Amino acid sequence: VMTDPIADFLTRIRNANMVKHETLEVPASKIKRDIAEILKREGFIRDVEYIEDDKQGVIRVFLKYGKNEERVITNLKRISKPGLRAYVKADEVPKVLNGLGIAIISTSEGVITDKEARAKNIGGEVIAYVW
Amino acid sequence: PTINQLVRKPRKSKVEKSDSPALNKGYNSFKKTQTNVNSPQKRGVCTRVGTMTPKKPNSALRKYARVRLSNLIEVTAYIPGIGHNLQEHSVVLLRGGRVKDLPGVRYHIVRGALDTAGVNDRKQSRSKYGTKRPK
RNA sequence: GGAGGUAUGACAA
RNA sequence: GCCUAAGGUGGGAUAGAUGAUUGGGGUGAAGUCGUAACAAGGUAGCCGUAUCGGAAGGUGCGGCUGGAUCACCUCCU
RNA sequence: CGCGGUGCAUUAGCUAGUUGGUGAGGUAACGGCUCACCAAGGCCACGAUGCAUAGCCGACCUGAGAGGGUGAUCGGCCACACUGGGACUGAGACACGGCCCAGACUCCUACGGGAGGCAGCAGUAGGGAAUCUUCGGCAAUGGACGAAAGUCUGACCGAGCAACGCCGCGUGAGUGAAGAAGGUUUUCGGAUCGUAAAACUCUGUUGUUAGAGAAGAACAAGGACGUUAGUAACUGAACGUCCCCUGACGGUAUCUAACCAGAAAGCCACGGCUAACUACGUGCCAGCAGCCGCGGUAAUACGUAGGUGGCAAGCGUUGUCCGGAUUUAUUGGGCGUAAAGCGAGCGCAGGCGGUUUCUUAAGUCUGAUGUGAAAGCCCCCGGCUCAACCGGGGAGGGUCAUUGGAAACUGGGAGACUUGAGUGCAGAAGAGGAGAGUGGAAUUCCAUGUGUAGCGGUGAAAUGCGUAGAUAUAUGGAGGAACACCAGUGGCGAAGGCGGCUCUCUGGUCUGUAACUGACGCUGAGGCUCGAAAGCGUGGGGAGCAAACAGGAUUAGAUACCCUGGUAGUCCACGCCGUAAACGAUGAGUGCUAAGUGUUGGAGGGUUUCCGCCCUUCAGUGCUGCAGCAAACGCAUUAAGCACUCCGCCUGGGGAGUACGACCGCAAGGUUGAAACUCAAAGGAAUUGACGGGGGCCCGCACAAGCGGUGGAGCAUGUGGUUUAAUUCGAAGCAACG
RNA sequence: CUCGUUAAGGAACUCGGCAAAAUGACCCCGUAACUUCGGGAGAAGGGGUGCUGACUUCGGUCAGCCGCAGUGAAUAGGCCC
Ligand SMILES: [K+]
Ligand SMILES: [K+]
Ligand SMILES: [K+]
Ligand SMILES: [K+]
Ligand SMILES: [K+]
Ligand SMILES: [K+]
Ligand SMILES: [Mg+2]
Ligand SMILES: [Mg+2]
Ligand SMILES: [Mg+2]
Ligand SMILES: [Mg+2]
Ligand SMILES: [Mg+2]
Ligand SMILES: [Mg+2]
Ligand SMILES: [Mg+2]
Ligand SMILES: [Mg+2]
Ligand SMILES: [Mg+2]
Ligand SMILES: [Mg+2]
Ligand SMILES: [Mg+2]
Ligand SMILES: [Mg+2]
Ligand SMILES: [Mg+2]
Ligand SMILES: [Mg+2]
Ligand SMILES: [Mg+2]
Ligand SMILES: [Mg+2]
Ligand SMILES: [Mg+2]
Ligand SMILES: [Mg+2]
Ligand SMILES: [Mg+2]
């Protein structure tokens, strides 16, 4: 089934984060790779690695904690559910927590942040906030 | 609900209604139909004047009048104050408002309007109950 | 130690 | 001469007002009759159905625990 | 022509010149616009058709916004002109103040015949809760006509009435006390009305009077001149510069001066929500009341007086709209117990959908251009003594349109892959289902003997059965129904449900296998199917049990519980019914997320002589429990956690699962499914108490064991009634009555 | 007695629409409540019908003509609640 693997990915991250697990493994796709790389280079994750197996490329994540205890991620949320898909313009780009989080957007340029979108004056499909 | 459901049948609001349906309707003798008109007051003819017993926490003789309206809806109202010039066939003016004592009285009678005499020797809250100044 | 099954009483205050 | 509004006739459809009489419903300080439920409510109760009866309700069938009590098995601590 | 904006499916079919075509006609023009002919097509679940409702919009009110509600004044488009139809004229009508005809309605007649149409401005009647003078002028602005003056103009300018609304100013100001009297209150000392007043000083917004007296006016024509291009040439046309005259409002605005504090403040509320407190009268009466609720002899809740508070030429009240109301949740809610998961499944349509190359570009994003009238909202300016208001300029406003790019994502198309889904190989289990037959136990009945007075039943009895041989006892036979042990929060099935045994046929599930297809899947309205028990139809059957019913009892009564009997029914076959506390009171699917423990069916592995034990793993089936969730109870890899797709369902309680309608049904009745009116609660969970014909433990002249009394007599004393002029008043279960 | 016409009216006659009158054939259209779903139903209610030429693909059809009237006479249901 898996009618929303993006949200499954987000929720698996959330669950592991709540139990304070250290790593994850996911049946990956290119959009998941993009999101993982964005989180890697935005500071919500320590590390990410790839695995190539015949059915589908697995992607494994290594999460981040300020201490043994403190979490860097608090919660995520998909907006394009997809039952109601969220397309937005360069002015309607969200600002997650006045800049303390990040919204993840896909545009003509590619999969990017609200920073780059509101700078370039583009918009697109919103697929995830991150508090 | 899912958004598909909300498109297949949208949110249909909680239907509202009035505390005075008798005032929100009219009557034209030509076509003889209820004309829907939002009227604050009305005229009527008292078809009965009497007293009623109120609900349990209270005990009293509450003065009512059953009235025949301009729009041919017959209505029970309350005669506020102390004393009245009212009888059967006495023309009267009616305003809205419950009387929490009896259930079947959604209306009040107005003083100083028509055949209703102004209240006698009421000096405070005087506009209410409709009696001119003592000079 | 704990779980599943096996006659009438006035009204209001 | 064609077309044709109004009109007449006809059987239907549709919406409403009125209608002897009747049906239950709701409200109304101190009317009557029992006491069905709430405790094991004094026959455990309720749900559906049938039937009965002044009225609550009762009885049978099936189901449930939203069942109180003492006595066994299995389970967990 | 695209797109958009209102309710019902208790409205599912609609149309026949309707849909298209070949001709012809016709219109300013396209075309079924119209006629013939040919064909049978066309619209719709993306809501056609029908019913109801409604002018639409800019805009207005509200709101954080999303949105909601309205469509008054001003502007735009549309439609109408007593109702219906038709044309003429004309550039333009199928014509408000035009024609013809039909109808309704009225009017004047000399009674022969005519005439008319205020939803034009005023105005009348009526309706109504209710909203204007039967005014002046064309001076302005605009329009018709005319060469022009000018004529007309209920358009428009103005004035008038209305506190209907918004804005502004008033209704005097300064000084004036331990504080006049009087009102109210009092703890009788005082307190408050209160610097409020009187008094003295000042002012004249305003008002009264008398004088002065704007702008709005531009003009046009006319009297003069001058320039242009037309001229054979002048009048004349166009253009410029002077003279000339024009105001309903109105002798109003406005300004000046004289005078008087003099002529100018009330409404509601004061228990809490809510700012604001006492006195008197009243006594669940009078009355108050937006909600909670006040009032029953000491009312901050009624009424009055005083006092205070909020507003102020207004105040309050009703009615309507929005908000608060996340109380229809897109923003922005929920369904274990409160409202709600259809009883459950099979599946058409739709909604959603694994990874991935290439492609497109419908969605999406984006540049520029155009338009989105004006007025209005908003920003900056400026004039009205400020303000309202008025004017100028700007800004913004579109799920808007054309063109031009990207394409990451969704979608479209051409493929490719296997994890999902399914097929195949091999195995496992099983009250899985339907049909057929067979069984032992027990009851009931019948037969045969033994044996004889009670058996049965109850809290008590009794009805009953039994001496005609009961009960019971032993041997058989008939008949029906259900399957002791095994049997377990064990198994199967989608649910309901399914337990003896064997056979016939058959379904789903699980495990590995990794051969095969290669996203084929999930959900699934509307439909179809199954569906406890009761119940209905037809025919069999009927052992026991048992509604109804009978009788006995009980009871104040007992239409019941108890007893003895006992009919339908329970059972079989078919056909109907289609409801349940149809419950895990938890929709289905997928994924992720501590652990513990048992258990059912397997598989694999490491041992074990095998058995067995251990470790791993799948599919179920229980308990404990971390995180988290939860209003709590409780849930927790069989979620009620985190998430996503779809379906169903809820929007307070009752009325009411009722009525109306439709469908279904042999009927009973089922499915869908409201409103009027009514309440300010209904409800869930949990807590403390109290209670229990609930349990446990304990105690007390509490019972038991006993002794002696009261109640019966007479008297004393007290009490109740009753009589009395009074029989003083109080005391009323224990806890009043020597 | 058996028949036929009748002005205006039209059941006022009468115990009572008795009797008589009216309808009456064929084609086409259309046809309610209720229902045992078969019916009701020939419901009701309407229209047309003659002659002469063209026309069909043989019945419809068009045009014209005549009369108060075209099942031209006779024979044939009155209906509804
Ligand atoms: K059940
Ligand atoms: K209209
Ligand atoms: K018309
Ligand atoms: K008062
Ligand atoms: K039967
Ligand atoms: K107790
Ligand atoms: Mg009881
Ligand atoms: Mg009981
Ligand atoms: Mg009975
Ligand atoms: Mg709001
Ligand atoms: Mg006119
Ligand atoms: Mg207060
Ligand atoms: Mg008052
Ligand atoms: Mg008092
Ligand atoms: Mg519930
Ligand atoms: Mg504009
Ligand atoms: Mg049955
Ligand atoms: Mg638990
Ligand atoms: Mg004793
Ligand atoms: Mg004695
Ligand atoms: Mg004593
Ligand atoms: Mg005659
Ligand atoms: Mg007669
Ligand atoms: Mg006859
Ligand atoms: Mg004939």
Closest-lying nucleotide for B59 based on CA to C1': E284
| CB-defined contacts A:B, below 8 A | 4
Q: Coil, helix or strand for B85?
A: coil
Rg (CA), chain A: 15
Rg (CA), chain B: 20
Residues of chain B contacting A83 with CB distance shorter than 8 Å: 2-4
> Any idea how long chain B is?
135
Q: How many distinct helices (H) and strands (E) make up chain A?
A: 3, 8
Angle, helices A30-42 vs A5-19, to 10°: value is 40
Task: Return the residue matching tokens 């809205």.
Answer: B96
Residue A103, classified by CB atoms within 10 Å of its CB into exposed (0-12), middle (13-18) or buried (19+), is buried
Closest Cα of chain A to B13: distance in Å?
22
Q: Coil, helix or strand for B108?
A: strand
Q: How far apart are CA B126 and CA B101, in angstroms?
A: 23
CB A127 within 8 A of CB A78: yes
CB B82 within 8 A of CB B121: no
- Sequence-distant (6+) residues with CB within 8 A of A78 are A4, A6, A7, A10, A127, A128
Q: How far apart are CA A15 and CA A9, in angstroms?
A: 10
DSSP letters, A16-72, are HHHHT-SEEEEE--HHHHHHHHHHHHHTS-SEEEEE--SS--EEEEE--BSSSS-BS
To one decimal, the resolution in angstroms is 2.9
Q: How far apart are CA A15 and CA A60, in angstroms?
A: 15
- Which residues is B28 bridged to in the sheet? B33
The identity of residue A53, as a single letter, is D
> Protein footprint on strand C: which nucleotides are under 7 Å from a CB?
11-13
Structure token digits, residue A103: 């919204």
Q: CB of B60 under 7 A from strand C?
A: no
Residue B122, classified by CB atoms within 10 Å of its CB into exposed (0-12), middle (13-18) or buried (19+), is middle
Q: How far apart are CA B112 and CA B84, in angstroms?
A: 11
Q: How far apart are CA A38 and CA A102, in angstroms?
A: 10
List the determination method.
cryo-EM
Q: How far apart are CA A2 and CA A16, in angstroms?
A: 19
Q: How far apart are CA A56 and CA A59, in angstroms?
A: 10
CB B71 within 8 A of CB B26: yes
- Residue B57 CA and nucleotide D34 C1' are separated, in Å, by 28
